[PDB]
Design goal:
28% of the residues lie in helices and 27% in strands. With 170 residues, the chain is of the alpha+beta class. It has a single domain, classed as Peptide deformylase (Peptide Deformylase), CATH 3.90.45. The strands form 2 sheets. Strands 1-2-3-6-7 form a 5-stranded antiparallel beta sheet. It is globular. 32% of the residues are buried. Removes the formyl group from the N-terminal Met of newly synthesized proteins. Requires at least a dipeptide for an efficient rate of reaction. N-terminal L-methionine is a prerequisite for activity but the enzyme has broad specificity at other positions. Belongs to the polypeptide deformylase family.
């Protein structure tokens, strides 16, 4: 029940996703997103990565191995604290990583669950980084854009050939 993951170069990855309004099918869609994420060995997946410009992502802290499963619609970061550099990649940019992506160490996020119910959550560390990365997808942002300019430019130069290849494939 998996969806193909959209690669770098697909314009859907760069759109501002639309808020979710009708939650009737969100549980089922979220289930297929999780199956896609799990088969690709990821820990998060955003709706734009399966071709859907909607403010929705799933993430986990293999369905039987997870401590917490998150279905997150209409997320807004309402608080952030701290700044920690860390390693990230992306299923839309397979095999490409940066080890110096700056993120807030702690966040507060307002969102709706798969039934449309308002929730508030605070995360620190790894899961705060996963949520920042996924929310970024909903704003049309990819992790290298979080790098300071010299580091972003180095990343794009160093990986130029693979980035070109993805775009052709997309």
């Amino acid at each position: 029940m998996v969806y193909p993951i959209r690669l770098y170069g697909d314009p859907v990855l760069r759109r501002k996703a639309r808020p979710v309004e009708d939650f009737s099918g969100i549980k089922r869609l979220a289930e297929d997103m999780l199956e896609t994420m799990f088969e690709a060995k990821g820990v998060g997946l955003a709706a734009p990565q399966i071709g859907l410009s909607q403010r929705l992502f799933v993430a986990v802290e293999l369905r039987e191995l997870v401590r917490r499963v998150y279905v997150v619609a209409n997320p807004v970061i309402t608080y952030r604290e701290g700044l920690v550099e860390g390693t990230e990649g992306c299923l839309s940019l397979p095999g490409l990583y940066s080890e110096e992506v700056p993120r807030a160490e702690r966040i507060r996020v307002e969102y709706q669950d798969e039934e449309g119910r308002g929730r508030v959550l605070e995360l620190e560390g790894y899961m705060a980084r996963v949520f920042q990365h996924e929310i970024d997808h909903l704003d049309g942002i990819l992790f290298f854009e979080r790098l300071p300019k010299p580091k972003r430019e180095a990343f794009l130069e160093a990986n130029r050939a693979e980035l070109v290849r993805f775009q052709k494939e997309a």
